[PDB]
Each structure stands twice: as structure tokens, then as C-alpha cells.
Design a protein around this ligand. Structure first.
Ligand SMILES: [Zn+2]
Ligand SMILES: [Zn+2]
Length: 51
């Protein structure tokens, strides 16, 4: 089967739990580790579940 997964654009790891999606850049997401490290603070991000 084909599945749609979310990959972190900061570290290339899986994004599980909460994803931090850029509201400006196309198709851009951070994992909680990279979000906590302060990546991509120059744009507003949307925080919502990444099941
Ligand atoms: Zn990451
Ligand atoms: Zn952005």
C-alpha cells in the first residue's frame, strides 16, 4: 500500500505526533525536535497532529 508520510525538512526524520508546517513555504514541515531547536523561526508555522 501507498502511505502519505511527513518527513522533517530540518533533519529528514519522520514527523510523528505534532507537525510544524510552514504557512509560507510550500510543503515544509518540522519535527518537534527541530521545532524545539529553533529552526525556521522567520515564518509562521501551523502546529497540528501528524498521526
Ligand atoms: Zn527534524
Ligand atoms: Zn517557511
Amino acid at each position: 500500500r501507498e502511505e502519505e508520510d511527513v518527513i522533517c525538512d530540518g533533519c529528514n526524520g519522520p514527523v510523528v505526533g505534532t507537525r510544524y508546517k510552514c504557512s509560507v513555504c510550500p510543503d515544509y514541515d518540522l519535527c518537534s525536535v527541530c521545532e524545539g531547536k529553533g529552526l525556521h523561526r522567520g515564518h509562521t508555522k501551523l502546529a497540528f497532529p501528524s498521526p
